[PDB]
């Protein structure tokens, strides 16, 4: 919980130094999937990270179609090498990488946004049925609405047909007294941005 607070109170700054920024796609799609349904606390401290990364980052495909792309082959390999280096006592000043390779890693890192939101939405509908309450129900809606505003039409128009899709075909509103807020509101925030989606 500590080293997730360390990292949150410092996310905004990492998005800058042209080396660290690479890690930020990974670390996010990792936080999203590690959102627990039993640990109210771990989850509040993860949303902290997830919303901070979204507040200072555009969810956008930044690939000029450059063929080498892919998250593995190009981002993961570098991320692991940086970490291996950092772990063995060495520091990041001693870490030498080609300005070519490190910009492949960064651009290819902006691909995973799609496969990761399918996992955030999944984790939301799982949370509709938890006795998390209030403070944290709200904070979660901030993260879903901030994530939306930091989205280009390419990605957003996907996110929309994914709330639309999952809102109808779901097995997720059983348990007694649900948090409808966590799913109805994120819809409203789609219609704010795209009135056209309302007619239907």
């Amino acid at each position: 919980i500590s080293s997730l607070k360390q990292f949150t109170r410092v996310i905004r700054f990492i998005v800058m130094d042209k080396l660290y920024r690479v890690h930020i796609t990974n670390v996010l799609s990792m936080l999203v999937s590690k959102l627990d349904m039993n640990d109210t606390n771990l989850t509040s401290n993860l949303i902290n990270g997830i919303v901070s990364i979204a507040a200072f980052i555009p969810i956008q495909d930044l690939t000029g179609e450059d063929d080498y792309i892919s998250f593995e082959s190009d981002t993961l390999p570098l991320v692991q090498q940086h970490f291996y280096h950092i772990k063995c006592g060495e520091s990041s000043k001693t870490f030498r990488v080609d300005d070519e390779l490190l910009n492949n890693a960064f651009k290819a890192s902006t691909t995973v946004f799609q496969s990761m939101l399918k996992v955030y939405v999944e984790k939301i509908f799982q949370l509709v049925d938890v006795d998390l309450e209030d403070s944290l129900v709200t904070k979660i809606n901030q993260t879903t609405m901030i994530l939306q505003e930091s989205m280009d039409d390419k990605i957003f128009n996907y996110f929309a047909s994914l709330l639309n899709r999952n809102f109808w075909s779901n097995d997720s509103f059983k348990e007694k007294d649900p948090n409808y807020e966590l799913v109805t509101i994120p819809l409203a925030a789609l219609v704010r941005r795209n009135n056209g989606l309302s007619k239907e």
Binding site: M37, N38, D39, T40, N41, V130, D131
Partner: protein, 244 residues
């Protein structure tokens, strides 16, 4: 707040007893052990790891016998296997004393089930650190059972548990596929020896002895004898041939 996993009786917010799930991890990190149900009995096998050269060969028995006709093998915290098999016998002898017939496999299983399950009821006793594979021959043929720390138990055609769990379970499914009518009492023994030799690659660091016991209505007239001498080499030599 939290702390839902330091106490044993305690329900996590979505229905789970976490201390049990942790014990299953201790199971997964121990010797690999299996059971096969053939057409008139059961065969049991275990992986004995060899810490150093000073461990005596053939002389640290892991498979325990219950009554005269039942076999138990376990993976995990070994002393918990013993404490469980002990309560296993006190139970199988309560039964015999009063109802004369030696305790039926399915009824034996339900009795271990309740001992284990009852070790998941109070904050002040920890679950068993073993998944136990056991079985034998009763009035209506052969029965193989497996029982995890939660108290769960079911009857299997074959079963595995231990580090080499996923690996054996897969070779096990291969036989249930090829021979639906079950293996022969003798064949099941040759094969159990194969399966252990394989699920050893998941622990190939240290060396190992094999140990097999069986209970067959034709090959040991219903009793639980061990597999030894010529018939043990019969199978140790069959494994070497399907490893190379």
């Amino acid at each position: 707040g939290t702390g839902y996993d330091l106490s044993n009786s305690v329900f996590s917010p979505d229905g789970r007893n976490f201390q049990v799930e942790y014990a299953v991890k201790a199971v997964e990190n121990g010797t690999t052990s299996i059971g096969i149900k053939c057409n008139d009995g059961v065969v049991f096998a275990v992986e004995k790891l060899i810490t150093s050269k000073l461990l005596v060969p053939q002389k640290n028995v892991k498979i325990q016998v219950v009554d005269r006709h039942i076999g138990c093998v376990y993976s995990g915290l070994i002393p918990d296997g013993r404490h469980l098999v002990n309560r296993g016998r006190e139970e199988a002898a309560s039964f015999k004393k009063l109802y004369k017939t030696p305790i039926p496999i399915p009824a034996f299983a339900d009795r271990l089930g309740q001992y284990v399950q009852a070790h998941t009821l109070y904050n002040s006793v920890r679950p068993f650190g073993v998944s136990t594979i056991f079985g034998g021959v009763d009035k209506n043929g052969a029965h193989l059972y497996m029982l995890e720390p939660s108290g769960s138990y079911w009857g299997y055609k074959g079963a595995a548990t231990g580090k080499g769990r996923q690996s054996a379970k897969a070779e096990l499914e291969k036989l249930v596929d090829h021979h639906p009518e079950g293996l022969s009492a003798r064949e099941a023994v040759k094969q159990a020896a194969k399966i252990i030799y394989l699920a050893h690659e998941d622990n190939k660091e240290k060396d190992f002895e094999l140990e097999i016991s069986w209970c067959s209505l034709s090959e040991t007239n219903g009793l639980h004898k061990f597999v030894k001498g010529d018939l043990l080499q019969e199978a140790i030599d069959f494994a070497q041939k399907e490893i190379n």
